[PDB]
Write a protein that binds this ligand. Structure first.
Ligand SMILES: NC(=O)C1=CN([C@@H]2O[C@H](COP(=O)(O)OP(=O)(O)OC[C@H]3O[C@@H](n4cnc5c(N)ncnc54)[C@H](OP(=O)(O)O)[C@@H]3O)[C@@H](O)[C@H]2O)C=CC1
Length: 309
């Protein structure tokens, strides 16, 4: 139950440590504690501003013999300013250098969204995406073994299908917002049908991010099932995603929560309680408000997300 299989043949551990908003001063101990506790998957990004400190914690884990490199699944992501095909391998190499790794298990296009190299998120810096050219550069990173799997993030089933149609190396993963509040049934089915793995980001509904407006652990259905099964609301949210065949990326820098977030394997949500997830109102929490704009290729939220419910 503790891994899913990618179209590359690789195993992705079902639970990964999230590192968004894990500040440099705390991320190291979080990664170190998480892997000692049994985590074998770390989700990273250049734009999280902490990959050097993650690299220092991975180095410590390897040097203390907690794990070997081959035991871990490390993900990073190509930021929106590195979409130019010549820029892709250089961005991967920057993350490899900071993480002090020879390869990533997964390198993702972070968003189907592009800005001019080295610029800030601001509408004059928006450039028309060229996802096929960017993917082509991602495929050479895969050929080189520097990214043992390549994938995408924040791609609707429409944009994922458009890319699959021209890919000589299919995306292994589409990492999207997915939790009881945003169940992604269409993309779930699409990913199952195309052999693409769905990794759930913000699987608790990112309760530490106020601008995301998440309420997932306060959902009556979640609190009820938690009370019925003797689990925490977080455990119920995480287990739901795992039973859908999705990997989850719970973020914590708290040792007790890091441990509880891995305790999602030796118990199940009965089918009758799975039925109750129907009653949860659906709302996307990470809407991409800042890349939907008259200056954007996405003039509306519908254009960015292709209408998904
Ligand atoms: N565009 C993309 O591809 C995106 C990727 N991601 C990835 O997904 C990860 C997870 O999503 P994220 O938005 O961070 O949010 P999560 O849904 O993982 O929620 C994290 C928050 O929940 C708290 N928390 C963690 N465990 C528990 C628990 N057992 N009970 C109660 N509260 C808990 C954390 O606090 P504490 O630390 O105190 O435990 C933190 O405030 C990110 O960190 C990142 O790696 C996220 C968003 C976008």
């Amino acid at each position: 139950a503790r891994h899913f299989v990618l179209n590359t043949g690789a195993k992705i551990p079902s639970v990964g440590l999230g590192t968004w908003q894990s500040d440099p001063g705390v991320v190291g101990d979080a990664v170190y504690t998480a892997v000692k506790a049994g985590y074998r998957h770390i989700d990273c990004a250049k734009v999280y501003g902490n990959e050097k400190e993650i690299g220092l914690a991975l180095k410590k884990l390897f040097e203390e013999g907690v794990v070997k490199r081959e035991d871990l699944f490390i993900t990073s992501k190509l930021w929106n300013d590195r979409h130019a095909p010549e820029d892709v391998p250089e961005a991967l190499n920057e993350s490899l250098t900071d993480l002090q790794l020879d390869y990533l298990d997964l390198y993702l296009i972070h968003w189907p969204f592009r800005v001019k190299k080295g610029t800030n998120t601001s509408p004059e810096n928006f450039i028309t995406p060229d996802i096929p050219a960017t993917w082509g550069a991602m495929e050479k990173c895969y050929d080189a073994g520097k990214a043992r799997a390549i994938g995408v993030s924040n791609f609707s089933s429409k944009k994922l299908g458009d890319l699959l149609a021209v890919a000589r190396v299919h995306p292994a993963v589409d990492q999207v917002e997915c939790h009881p509040g945003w169940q992604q049934t269409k993309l779930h089915n699409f990913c199952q049908s195309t052999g693409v793995h769905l990794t759930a980001y913000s699987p608790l509904g990112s309760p530490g991010t106020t601008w995301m407006n998440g309420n997932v652990l306060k959902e009556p259905v979640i609190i009820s099932i938690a009370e019925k099964l003797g689990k925490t609301p977080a455990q119920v949210a995480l287990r739901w995603n795992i039973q859908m065949g999705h990997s989850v990326l719970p973020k914590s820098t708290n040792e007790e929560r890091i441990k509880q977030n891995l305790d999602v394997y030796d118990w199940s949500i009965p089918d009758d309680l799975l039925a109750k997830f129907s009653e949860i109102k659906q709302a996307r929490l990470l809407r991409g408000n800042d890349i939907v704009n008259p200056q954007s290729v996405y003039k509306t939220h519908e254009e960015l997300w292709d209408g998904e419910l």
